[PDB]
Write a structure and sequence with these properties.
It is classed as ribosome. This is part of a larger assembly, with chains A (49 residues), B (48 residues), C (102 residues), D (145 residues), E (116 residues) and F (112 residues). Chain C is mainly β and 102 residues long. Chain C is built from no helices and ten strands. Helices cover 0% and strands 54% of the residues of chain C. Chain C has a four-stranded antiparallel sheet with strand order 2-1-5-6, with no helix packed on it. Chain E has one domain. The chains are: A little secondary structure (49), B little secondary structure (48), C mainly beta (102), D alpha/beta (145), E mainly alpha (116), F alpha+beta (112). Bound molecules: magnesium ion (55 copies). Chain E binds three RNA strands through helix 1, helix 2 and helix 3.
RNA sequence: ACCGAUAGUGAACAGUACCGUGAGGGAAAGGUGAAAAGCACCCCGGAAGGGGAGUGAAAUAGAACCUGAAACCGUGUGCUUACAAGUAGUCAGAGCCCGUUAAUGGGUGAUGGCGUGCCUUUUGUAGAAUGAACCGGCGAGUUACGAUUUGAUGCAAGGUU
RNA sequence: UAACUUGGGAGUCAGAACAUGGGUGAUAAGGUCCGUGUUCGAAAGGGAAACAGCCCAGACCACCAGCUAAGGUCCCAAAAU
RNA sequence: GACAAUGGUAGGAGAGCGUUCUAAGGGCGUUGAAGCAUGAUCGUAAGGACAUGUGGAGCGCUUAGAAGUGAGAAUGCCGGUG
């Protein structure tokens, strides 16, 4: 190839999900968490088992 | 005791339509000089 | 002198010499289009077609395949984080009626 | 927005009619007249300008009622003072100021807009068979009953 | 690397301010209140493009009903008998004939009137 | 032509100077001097000092006839404020604005 | 494949002004021009400020000195308004002015129809439930190490440091 | 025209009115507790004067084109004095 | 070419617009860059060009990579203004 024309193999890359940036992305306000309770707090959730 | 809303620019400007000032009397000093005030004495810049 | 034709899904009232604005036909510029459904002819002699005058074409010449002015479609729901926005330009054709029949 | 006639000033013609009110019931006279003043019998009716024309009612003291609604059917009124409710019966208004009996019935059938107020000023009502408006040359008009 | 939020925020806010010319007073200068009005005026326009097809159909019928009663016909019995005669002309076209050519309108009244 | 003169950073507040300034615009210069000597506002000898300066520029820099001149424009713009404080009661202070003004009048003979 | 003056050291000019009896806490504040050539001289004015003139490529580059947004304050104007009940617009529509990235153009708007803001929390809010005076800047799912599942690639009873 | 199995990723555990079958209560409550359906929630549009839950009916976008539903046809206000 | 589908909150999936920086290639600029202002322009959306005024020295495009990557609300912090 050349250093100004290179392309990766097809299906190797995806852009990652940024969460919490406005309404139309689908993960805008509550950022996937749902509304309240212990699982919606930072560092929340409970230990496995 | 305190205003519930701000007052807009139009309502402020409609309020001070009478907040004006008037022109004075302005007679003349007939003998020698510029204009004086009416029923007054032309002392300075005046001979009446 | 006076005709009512049927084009698109709607009806137009024409006189020979004027310009009309119709939903998009499939002709080219400078071509001659002929209209086939005529519902009523007035003027000096009156013909009333039921539904059609059975004859009575209208010829016209074609100018300016075009697109309309852009409108913006916008809606939103009130407390719910949802809205959409999109544009639209509707196509049209311009024609000039030049000759009438009966 | 192809092609639809819209009326205008320098475009409309207003004329003058005369209705006589004897032997007519109050509401059935008034519903006929209020469509004249709006112009809903013109073929060139347009909702945002004042087409429609002038009406004169000349007898107005021979308006009939049906039933017992000349001793009933009171008309109320409030003066925006405490306890200032006032009233008069319908038979009372007939013998005393009958012109205001008819013109209140007709203006209640007109819309309350700016144009609806201006259309209601084209009504002229008189008790007894004479009217001053001979200069405007009005016509007779029979009610399509 | 640090990216500072330069020049992209004005450009977004100005074309909302510019999209609100002619609005009263504070609603054409301040961004938070002009945005909130431009959302409202887009919602109104969607609603009113649908009612415009209702308003004009109501205006056409009113004029046909006035023109038919000069020939002792209702609106109802005109367009009943006009259907049985086989005529398929609009309300819009039928309203324009009655204004322009009264003599032609009186002729299709008779073809509807004898079809009953 | 036109002559002008400005006076920058005048300590009087701009609302107070625009009252007397509205009496003199549109009038010819001989009346405007007579008005400013007879209104007893505090702004009046400051405007009158400025209108003298603009008349003297028309005679010297431009060689106009001072007998027939008219005041085209007269206006006052804001300058920078001085921010002071005042102690009120129970340990609390309040802010006080010392306003300033830029005064501009132009004068012309009405011809080209 | 670190920041570029609300950043980056608290500090590009300071552990100073300042606060505190004291241990102690703790800021704000960069940019004329290539060169100072930094406005001789005249005029108004008590001065401050200014108009000319002159320097300079440029002085709406004059020291409060690069560029100079918005809120906000004003001066002129083309169209409109003193019988009218309002979430301020929107759709229709005369009349009056103008003439574009030249296209079924632009500004204003007599009159008519329709129409109870935004976010958050809620069974449910125009809501007399919460929050926001306005403008501007800053301001919130990251990284390291392990695990597990997808996709891609190489080799294959071998693969890999 | 769906169903089922395996695996990755969730949110939900405050519900409301209407009709109907029943307890409780006073054959009281826009009451409270269970069952069966619809709608709201998360659904605009037309009607019910106005009115989340009632009747009709499920909005990809233009159109100054037509047929109908529930409800309606003296004027306000479209259609039969 | 026909046929069908396309309201939507918690929420799952997919495609994309823009910002700063780096590599490579290829370009623009004192015959006026970036920024600022105005405009009756183009695109399905986020958004992209052109002209004219100000301004007085740096900046786009293509492909790929990497992130302090997008604000209207937190009795948010700091400054200006009412
Ligand atoms: Mg994605
Ligand atoms: Mg969602
Ligand atoms: Mg939000
Ligand atoms: Mg989740
Ligand atoms: Mg929350
Ligand atoms: Mg909960
Ligand atoms: Mg939860
Ligand atoms: Mg914590
Ligand atoms: Mg004023
Ligand atoms: Mg940087
Ligand atoms: Mg920001
Ligand atoms: Mg319809
Ligand atoms: Mg002083
Ligand atoms: Mg004290
Ligand atoms: Mg610092
Ligand atoms: Mg800076
Ligand atoms: Mg000390
Ligand atoms: Mg600091
Ligand atoms: Mg000096
Ligand atoms: Mg400049
Ligand atoms: Mg400054
Ligand atoms: Mg420089
Ligand atoms: Mg500057
Ligand atoms: Mg008036
Ligand atoms: Mg209304
Ligand atoms: Mg509650
Ligand atoms: Mg509130
Ligand atoms: Mg209130
Ligand atoms: Mg508050
Ligand atoms: Mg803010
Ligand atoms: Mg793997
Ligand atoms: Mg493999
Ligand atoms: Mg449970
Ligand atoms: Mg429960
Ligand atoms: Mg209950
Ligand atoms: Mg009950
Ligand atoms: Mg149940
Ligand atoms: Mg909920
Ligand atoms: Mg459903
Ligand atoms: Mg509904
Ligand atoms: Mg309704
Ligand atoms: Mg009811
Ligand atoms: Mg609703
Ligand atoms: Mg029908
Ligand atoms: Mg029926
Ligand atoms: Mg009404
Ligand atoms: Mg009717
Ligand atoms: Mg659908
Ligand atoms: Mg959908
Ligand atoms: Mg996802
Ligand atoms: Mg230039
Ligand atoms: Mg840059
Ligand atoms: Mg340089
Ligand atoms: Mg950020
Ligand atoms: Mg805030």
């Amino acid at each position: 190839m050349k250093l100004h024309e290179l392309k990766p193999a097809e299906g190797s890359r995806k852009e990652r999900n940024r969460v919490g940036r406005g309404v139309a992305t689908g993960n805008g306000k509550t950022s996937g968490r749902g509304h309240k309770g212990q699982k919606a707090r930072s560092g929340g959730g409970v230990r496995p088992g | 005791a305190v205003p519930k809303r701000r007052t807009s620019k139009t309502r402020k400007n409609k309020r001070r339509t009478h907040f004006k000032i008037s022109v004075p009397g302005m007679t003349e000093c007939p003998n020698c000089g510029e204009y004086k005030l009416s029923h007054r004495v032309c002392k300075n810049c005046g001979s009446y | 002198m006076f005709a009512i034709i049927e084009t698109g899904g709607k009806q137009i009232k024409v006189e020979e010499g004027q310009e009309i604005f119709v939903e998009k036909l499939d002709v080219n510029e400078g071509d001659t289009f002929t209209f086939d459904k005529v519902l009523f002819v007035g003027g000096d002699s009156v013909k009333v077609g039921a539904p059609t005058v059975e004859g009575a074409t209208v010829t016209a010449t074609v100018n300016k395949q075009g697109r309309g002015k852009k409108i913006t479609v916008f809606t939103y729901k009130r407390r719910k984080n949802s809205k959409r926005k999109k544009g639209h330009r509707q196509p049209y054709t311009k024609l000039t009626i030049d000759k009438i029949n009966a | 927005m192809r092609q639809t006639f819209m009326a205008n000033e320098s475009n409309i013609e207003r004329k003058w009619y005369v209705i006589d009110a004897e032997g007519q019931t109050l509401g059935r006279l008034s519903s006929e007249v209020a469509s004249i003043l709006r112009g809903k019998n013109k073929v060139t009716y347009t909702p945002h300008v004042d087409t429609g024309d002038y009406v004169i009612v000349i007898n107005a003291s021979k308006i009939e009622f049906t039933g017992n609604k000349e001793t009933d059917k009171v008309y109320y009124r409030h003066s925006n003072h405490p306890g200032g409710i006032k009233s008069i019966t319908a038979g009372e208004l007939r013998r005393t100021n009958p012109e205001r009996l008819i013109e209140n019935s007709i203006k209640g059938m007109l819309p309350s807009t700016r144009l609806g107020e201006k259309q209601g000023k084209k009504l002229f009502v008189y008790g007894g068979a004479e009217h001053p408006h001979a200069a405007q040359q009005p016509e007779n008009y029979e009610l399509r009953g | 690397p640090r990216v500072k939020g330069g020049t992209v925020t004005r450009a977004r806010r100005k074309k909302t301010i510019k999209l609100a010319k002619g609005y009263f007073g504070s609603k054409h200068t301040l961004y938070k209140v002009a945005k909130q009005q431009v959302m409202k005026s887009g919602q109104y326009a969607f609603r009113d493009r649908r009612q415009r097809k209702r308003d004009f159909r109501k205006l056409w019928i009113t004029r046909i009903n006035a023109a038919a009663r000069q020939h002792e016909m209702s609106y109802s019995r005109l367009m009943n008998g006009l259907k049985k005669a086989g005529i398929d002309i609009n309300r819009k076209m039928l309203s324009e004939i009655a204004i322009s050519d009264e003599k032609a309108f009186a002729q299709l009244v008779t073809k509807a009137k004898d079809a009953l | 032509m036109e002559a002008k003169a400005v006076a920058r950073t005048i300590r009087i507040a701009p609302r107070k100077v625009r009252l007397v300034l509205d009496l003199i615009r549109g009038k010819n210069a001989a009346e405007a001097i007579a008005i400013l000597k007879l209104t007893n506002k505090a702004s009046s000898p400051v405007i009158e000092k400025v209108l003298m300066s603009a008349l003297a520029n028309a005679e010297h820099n431009y060689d106009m006839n001072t007998d027939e001149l008219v005041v085209k424009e007269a206006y006052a713009n804001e300058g920078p404020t001085l921010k002071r404080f005042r102690p009120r009661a129970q340990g609390r202070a309040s802010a006080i604005n010392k306003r300033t003004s830029h005064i501009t009048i132009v004068v012309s003979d009405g011809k080209e």
